[PDB]
Design a protein around this ligand. Structure first.
Ligand SMILES: Cc1c(NCc2ccccc2-c2ccccc2)cnn(C)c1=O
Length: 101
């Protein structure tokens, strides 16, 4: 593993600790989220981010942060503000960017 892979594995571990229920662990299915795939053009989740680190697809911390923000933005687009998913997406977006400095 490269220096960037080691750092992103560290960041991903610290970000997933902020989602103890695993709401963001795996891709959102149309089965659990009616019409999700037709509303959200660029789905993202922590599991896909792990796969991209292992595949060495992140060539900068900037690219990794953009996928984390995408995941949070998707949840805040699809879910109404009064929902568990919206509130956790907003919480971990801010806390996550602070953690990564
Ligand atoms: C962020 C988000 C959702 N997250 C939950 C989820 C999504 C995919 C797989 C599994 C779960 C899950 C469900 C319950 C408990 C643990 C994991 C679900 N729906 N939508 C629309 C989302 O944005």
């Amino acid at each position: 593993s490269t220096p960037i892979q080691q750092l992103l594995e560290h960041f991903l571990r610290q970000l997933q600790r902020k989602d103890p229920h695993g709401f963001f662990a795996f891709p959102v299915t149309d089965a659990i989220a009616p019409g999700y795939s037709m509303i959200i053009k660029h789905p993202m989740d922590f599991g896909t981010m792990k796969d991209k680190i292992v595949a060495n697809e992140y060539k900068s911390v900037t690219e990794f942060k953009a996928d984390f923000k995408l995941m949070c933005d998707n949840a805040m687009t699809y879910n109404r503000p009064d929902t568990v998913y919206y509130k956790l997406a907003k919480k971990i977006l801010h806390a996550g960017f602070k953690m990564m400095s």
